[PDB]
Amino acid sequence: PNVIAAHKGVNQAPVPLKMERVGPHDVHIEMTAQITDIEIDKGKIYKAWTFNGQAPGPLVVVNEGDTIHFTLKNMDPVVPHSMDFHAVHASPSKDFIDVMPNKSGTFTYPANKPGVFMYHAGTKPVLQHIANGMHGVIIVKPKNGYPTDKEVDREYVLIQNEWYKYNDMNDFQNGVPSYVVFSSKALKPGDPNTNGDTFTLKEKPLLAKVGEKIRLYINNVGPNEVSSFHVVGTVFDDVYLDGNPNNHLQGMQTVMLPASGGAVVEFTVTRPGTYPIVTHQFNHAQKGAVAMLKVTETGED
Amino acid sequence: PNVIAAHKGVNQAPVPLKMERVGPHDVHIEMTAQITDIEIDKGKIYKAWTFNGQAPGPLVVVNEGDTIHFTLKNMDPVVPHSMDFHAVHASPSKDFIDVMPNKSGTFTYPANKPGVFMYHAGTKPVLQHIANGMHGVIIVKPKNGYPTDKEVDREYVLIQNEWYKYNDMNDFQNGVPSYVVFSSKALKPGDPNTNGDTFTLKEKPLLAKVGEKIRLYINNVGPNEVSSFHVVGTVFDDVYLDGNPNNHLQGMQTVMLPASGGAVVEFTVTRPGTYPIVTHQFNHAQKGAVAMLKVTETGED
Amino acid sequence: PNVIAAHKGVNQAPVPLKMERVGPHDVHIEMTAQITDIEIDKGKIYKAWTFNGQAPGPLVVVNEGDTIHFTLKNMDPVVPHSMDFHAVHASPSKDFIDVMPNKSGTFTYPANKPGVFMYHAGTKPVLQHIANGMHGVIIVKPKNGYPTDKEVDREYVLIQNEWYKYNDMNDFQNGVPSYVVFSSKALKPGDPNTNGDTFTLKEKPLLAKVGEKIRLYINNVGPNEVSSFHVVGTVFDDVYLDGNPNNHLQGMQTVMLPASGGAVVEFTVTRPGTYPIVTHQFNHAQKGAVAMLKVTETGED
Ligand SMILES: [Cu+2]
Ligand SMILES: [Cu+2]
Ligand SMILES: [Cu+2]
Ligand SMILES: [Cu+2]
Ligand SMILES: [Cu+2]
Ligand SMILES: [Cu+2]
Ligand SMILES: [Cu+2]
Ligand SMILES: [Cu+2]
Ligand SMILES: [Cu+2]
């Protein structure tokens, strides 16, 4: 359950995601694997294993049908890391392979399917890499959109994850989570971009305006728990399981998400006030998994 | 993990739900918050935090499009309580607010969406209020019914909940349930109306007649567990997730319910006998979550 | 948590499933209940309570609309056993009854609904019988097939189950699983047929050829956990919940399965390599629930 000697005193500053389109259906993405201290609860630092110094990692957004030319630069001084995108068709033993310390690797694979996909490290033991922070979301936008696109006023991305005792494989396998948390990742400049902690989305709530229809792209990265996702004070008008437009449910109070499962959910906020966003497995909500949406008459705070 | 000193010796007798329609699309509902001893297992009393002296609370049935004018009278001598209906569009910070001891509050909000919705207290810590008994179901009947209405012979309502060590926030967050239980709530005069205990629906089974198609309205209120709902000896002909007629599945053996999730399920019983109703997460079934349906040639016992 | 004295030194050799069609819509099936040592992890023997000396038990495949004439021969010297098929309409108290040691019983019931159904012992306490190994799958093939039948190149059956401390009712109710495992059952001669262990499907992977569309029939028998089923390196093109052709989802990364829940999932493998098959609840994957699919240019190893 200990800290790797070579990580003592290592705290690598966050590095921005690099992404550029190189053709109509081809995108370059470069990420790092790095060791970064994150305050997951007030007064509690976790020396996380991260992509780009965030946990969950940075949001990646591509279009349906894009081929991704992905480079991972491993800045960890001792532990290999790798990348597995749930969005892609790839050979795990050729394309999701380990990149050694202070090396890079480049892999190419297509994102054929629209949706809200988990990404994570694929290095054995996978549980250890996920639990220590190596998870995130890639959104693949559908070529023809969603049937409800014209009704949506505002969009945000939320992610649920757990935290355990530091680097403790016994706890990761057999224990209950110490914290369960939400984070938000920016779809556009100015949106909140946060890490998985117990407090930021309570103290700095997401904003909306009375009468708006909100869309959330959500994924429960786990590693271990399922999620019962609910927004207090509203009902989901439309739900698309895994973000695929064909998996269309209506009028849900709560959306069941497996570990790694995603959804697009849409709902209307009819009155001003503060709306909690929870997992309705309330032991997890009590351990941190409550975010806030503040709805005002103007949409500003 | 203790008993509040002011609740020592308090056992407030159940009070009937009060509901009256005041217009074609407007309904008044008055409930209490009260402290009531419930026998959750033989020889085991839980001094529950309840609505109206039942846990889960009384069934509320309204029509799609009704506006609810809801009054809560708090009879607890020391703890504030509140009401959150998953059925409604409301401002949580204005409409789901605490009512102080020996006060009342009135709130108004619409139920726009059909289905089988959880209700519960919204007072912090929400986990504590739910785990101590402040949960229940509100059914919103669809304006145009369900496509299978003409095939259904009999209807019942079941609810699943957990019980933990008394008022023990550590156990509520980190422990396994001590009991997991079903209760049934009356849709019409004469139907069974019970509390969440390990024994009543085994000793006094629900009744049906050979060849009938039964509909169950079900909700898993939690607080913490998901449910794998199954009726032994049959297969669900039709399932409507959250009770919304558009979320229509067929031929399911078992229905996955998130915490707070609901469904309408319909099935046929072809032969006389006793049919267990379970969560198929069998550790929970062993801890109380088995109800019985007795099917006879006449439908009487 | 002990071994029954009468099972000390008992290790009954596996007996083949007996099945013969006796009419266009009538099938005879004969199974045993027997006590058989299974190596569930390297160096760890579990003296399992089984059907036919396998755990999970043998695969049963029938056609939609078949009536099953089922015989159970109980070879256990002291414990009664029984059979509950989720596929059938039956009276649990008449048709799923106990067969005493060294007796047989015969029961008749129809399989009206297509899908991938759990079977298990129905003897009280059911949790004890399931946890000790008395579970399996019955597939009911749809009369008109699946809409995607013409696209499928290869089929396999996988089952997920847990193992606990030996015959320990406290652990079964309150503990975390010691192991979570996959097994594969043969649809046709030559397919792998294995027991639920931590290693066989890693050391002897399932085979496929580059470019194939694979169909898996899957069921999570539990007893206690839900499953977040995922194949690394691909996305499910089509999913049929519980194997019913009408419950059709597309483009899922991960399929949520309740305890006893099934699915038919189909996906394409585009590149050669080894593809892990997991539950994405990664504590369970770490405890054994990883199988391998080896994809080669020829489909041979
Ligand atoms: Cu390139
Ligand atoms: Cu890593
Ligand atoms: Cu994954
Ligand atoms: Cu009024
Ligand atoms: Cu309360
Ligand atoms: Cu709620
Ligand atoms: Cu016969
Ligand atoms: Cu048995
Ligand atoms: Cu069963």
Author numbering:
A (entry chain A), B (entry chain A), C (entry chain A): 15 to 315
From the paper:
Copper-containing nitrite reductases (CuNIRs) catalyze transformation of nitrite to nitric oxide, which has impacts on geochemical, agricultural, and medical health fields. CuNIRs typically have an ∼110 kDa homotrimeric structure, like a Reuleaux triangle. Each protomer contains one type 1 copper (T1Cu) and one type 2 copper (T2Cu) site. The Cys residue forms a peptide-bond bridge (Cys-His bridge) together with one of the His ligands at the T2Cu site to transfer the electron to the catalytic T2Cu site, which is coordinated by three His residues and an axial water molecule.
We bypassed the problem that NO2- decomposes during RT neutron data collection by using formic acid, a stable analog of NO2- and an inhibitor of NO2- reduction. RT ND and XRD data up to 1.90 and 1.20 Å resolution, respectively, were collected from a single crystal of C135A GtNIR in complex with deuterated formic acid and we determined the structure. The electron density shows that formate binds to the T2Cu atom, although it has low occupancy (0.54). The D atom on the central C atom of formate cannot be visualized in the neutron-scattering length density map although the omit map implies its presence, indicating that the formate ligand is unstable and its position at the T2Cu site fluctuates. Formate assumes a κ1-O mode, which is observed in a previously reported cryogenic structure. This finding suggests that differences of data collection temperature do not affect the binding mode of indecomposable ligands. Therefore, the difference of the NO2- binding manners is probably caused by X-ray photoreduction that is greatly facilitated at higher temperatures. OH- is present on one of the two axial sites of the T2Cu in the resting and NO2--bound states, but is partially replaced by a water molecule in the formate-bound structure. This finding means that the ligand at this position can easily absorb and desorb H+ at RT and interconvert between OH- and H2O.
